[PDB]
Design a protein around this ligand. Structure first.
Ligand SMILES: N=C1C(=O)NC(=O)c2cc(-c3ccccc3)sc21
Ligand SMILES: CCCCCCCCCCCCCC(=O)O
Ligand SMILES: CCCCCCCCCCCCCC(=O)O
Ligand SMILES: CCCCCCCCCCCCCC(=O)O
Ligand SMILES: CCCCCCCCCCCCCC(=O)O
Ligand SMILES: CCCCCCCC(=O)O
Length: 582
């Protein structure tokens, strides 16, 4: 293209162009104020319009890297604010852009983003919609500098919708707060997922990623031939590799190219892609990534013929081991969209181990004849965990289910900090609530997706400040062994009980005036401390104390003198409980 910025402006449109330019600048200049960014965006947009008007106009023939880098280097306070980054401006392209990416601060030193009052937000949304939305887009982008810019723009539009609907509702808070919570969680989960995928590529290698991709794509596109799935896997691996390096333009081009190839070859891939392939260029790759599983071919045979019975198993394996294992994983995955990707990789790894042993043995055919028997326990294990946990969840409901998990996990790893046990147990509770409402055939994929984030979150927090070698073992295990390692955790028999603290189990009238959420956290905090003090305490003894505590808060909250009740009845509850535990 004669003018790349003209092409981009016409493809994206003015509104999307301005939004993506704001994100791009916010992600590199994280410490620059909003008003400075708005001025860069307007200057860049006004320049782009001259290129749309005349493709031969001054500087319109320059690359997007050249234009972006040049504009970044005009920022007067670049050296004062970003010392090392100002030295990038002494370089020519493509070295200058490489220098810029190297000096992106992953976790910058910015204060916690405070959610204002509903009436304040809705008034700001009404009085200046553009400035309200774009400022918060700036606030999120500068805090998430590696977040894929178009996906951040996808969230922004869902935020606009939430405010548009709820700020004209009777009860604004009741409408808006749940929607902002939902968007905040999904946004945080999405950010942690992109960082995890990039970390997992470096740690475990390209082969492990290709195996994951074969499984996921085969489940999604079961009508596709293996050769087609293999080509998509190769392309997706390059996309992932390039996007993790963190060059937005290079990442966006590779994603656009793959989305374009998929949409030109729908008949060879999936019948569910028509809707996604009609959407604008900006939304295409994102829509495809989220597409529903296609229906699997009606009358597919068992894998026994090609992978167990055939006399050419060891021969077909030996000539190209990864191709053959890829074909196995393809055939297994497309028949089981109800499996987690990690389960399918456990089966492929089990099949691999068997062939390595058996193809070197006296009678290979005899040796691997029963290999599909070894798959039974691996499939059953997660299915039974879902069955048990979802049966418990239905009996108790979310809050009491979280308390059950809180007691379970405190007894397993009581060395973990109380805040971390509360946070993780509450989050695992939410995974229960979300995935147990799915039908059986979609429960394991749901569980896998949401557990992956909750457990990485736990492993990050824990790896920062280590306290349990067993948690570190599960956190440093292979991606396939991580969840089973956590499931294999036993009650700590060597743990010396925590010494009784009076204040820990002392309560005040303020608990009555706390919000539902913060009151739950205060109770759950106390429940963890109770189990840390008396881990040998039975379900019956714990229930008895928890029931007494429920009666104590009910009585002293609904009292003429609240304060002295909590002091006097609190001393009674404690003494009673200390005699009813051990
Ligand atoms: N409210 C908050 C907060 O407390 N601090 C954050 O870092 C954040 C990130 C969000 C986010 C939203 C959408 C996409 C990606 C990220 S919403 C948000
Ligand atoms: C001047 C900066 C232009 C904005 C950034 C590059 C354009 C991003 C396009 C993303 C859409 C295609 C790929 C995808 O679907 O993810
Ligand atoms: C983590 C390792 C899991 C992979 C098991 C072997 C499957 C190989 C398939 C392939 O190479 O495409
Ligand atoms: C208590 C957690 C929420 C309820 C869902 C239970 C899920 C059990 C483990 C599922 C395993 C999924 C991934 C894997 O195969 O390891
Ligand atoms: C050894 C002193 C024990 C005193 C009571 C400890 C605090 C128990 C918290 C229980 C919270 C869950 C029960 C509930 O919310 O109904
Ligand atoms: C201390 C927290 C341990 C988390 C265990 C997660 C097990 C599961 O995936 O069900």
């Amino acid at each position: 293209h004669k003018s790349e910025v003209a092409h981009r402006f016409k493809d994206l449109g003015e509104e999307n162009f301005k939004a993506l330019v704001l994100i791009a600048f916010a992600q590199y200049l994280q410490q620059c104020p909003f008003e400075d960014h708005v001025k860069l965006v307007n200057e860049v947009t006004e320049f782009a319009k001259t290129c749309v008007a005349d493709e031969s106009a001054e500087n319109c023939d320059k690359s997007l890297h050249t234009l972006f880098g040049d504009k970044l280097c005009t920022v007067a306070t670049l050296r004062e604010t970003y010392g090392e980054m100002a030295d990038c401006c002494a370089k020519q392209e493509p070295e200058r852009n490489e220098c810029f990416l190297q000096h992106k601060d992953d976790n910058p030193n910015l204060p916690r983003l405070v959610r204002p009052e509903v009436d304040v937000m809705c008034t700001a949304f009404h009085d200046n919609e553009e400035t309200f939305l774009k400022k918060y887009l700036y606030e999120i982008a500068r805090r998430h500098p590696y977040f894929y810019a178009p996906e951040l723009l996808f969230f922004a539009k869902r935020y606009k919708a939430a405010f548009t609907e709820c700020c004209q509702a009777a009860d604004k808070a009741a409408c808006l707060l749940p929607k902002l919570d939902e968007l905040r969680d999904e946004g945080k989960a999405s950010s942690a997922k992109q960082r995890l995928k990039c970390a997992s590529l470096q740690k475990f290698g390209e082969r492990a990623f290709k195996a994951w991709a074969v499984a996921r794509l085969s489940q999604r596109f079961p009508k596709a031939e293996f050769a087609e799935v293999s080509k998509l896997v190769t392309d997706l691996t390059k996309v992932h590799t390039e996007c993790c390096h963190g060059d937005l333009l290079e990442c966006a081009d590779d994603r656009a190219d793959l989305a374009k190839y998929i949409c030109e070859n729908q008949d060879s891939i999936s019948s569910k892609l028509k809707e996604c392939c009609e959407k604008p260029l900006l939304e295409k790759s994102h829509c495809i990534a989220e597409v529903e599983n296609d229906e699997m071919p009606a009358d597919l045979p068992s894998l026994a013929a090609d992978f167990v019975e055939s006399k050419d198993v060891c021969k077909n394996y030996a000539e190209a081991k990864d191709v053959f294992l890829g074909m196995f994983l393809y055939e297994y995955a497309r028949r089981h969209p109800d499996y987690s990707v990690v389960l399918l990789l456990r089966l492929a790894k089990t099949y691999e181990t068997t062939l390595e042993k058996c193809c070197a043995a006296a009678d290979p055919h005899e040796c691997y004849a029963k290999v599909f028997d070894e798959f039974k326990p691996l499939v059953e294990e997660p299915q039974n965990l879902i069955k048990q946990n979802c049966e418990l969840f239905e009996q108790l409901g979310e809050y009491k289910f979280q308390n059950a998990l809180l007691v379970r996990y405190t007894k397993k790893v009581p060395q973990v900090s109380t805040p971390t046990l509360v946070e993780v147990s509450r989050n695992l509770g939410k995974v229960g609530s979300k995935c147990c409402k799915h039908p059986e055939a979609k429960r394991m994929p749901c569980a896998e997706d949401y557990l992956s984030v909750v457990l990485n979150q736990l492993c990050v927090l824990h790896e920062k400040t280590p306290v349990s070698d067993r948690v570190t073992k599960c956190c440093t295990e292979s991606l396939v062994n991580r969840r089973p390692c956590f499931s294999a955790l036993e009650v700590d028999e060597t743990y010396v009980p925590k010494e009784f603290n009076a204040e820990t189990f002392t309560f005040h009238a303020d608990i009555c005036t706390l919000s539902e959420k913060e009151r739950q956290i205060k109770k759950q905090t106390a429940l963890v401390e109770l189990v840390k003090h008396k881990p040998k305490a039975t379900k019956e003894q714990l229930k008895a104390v928890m029931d007494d505590f429920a009666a104590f808060v009910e009585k002293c909250c609904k009292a003429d003198d609240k304060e002295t009740c909590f002091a006097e009845e609190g001393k009674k509850l404690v003494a009673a409980s200390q005699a009813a535990l051990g």
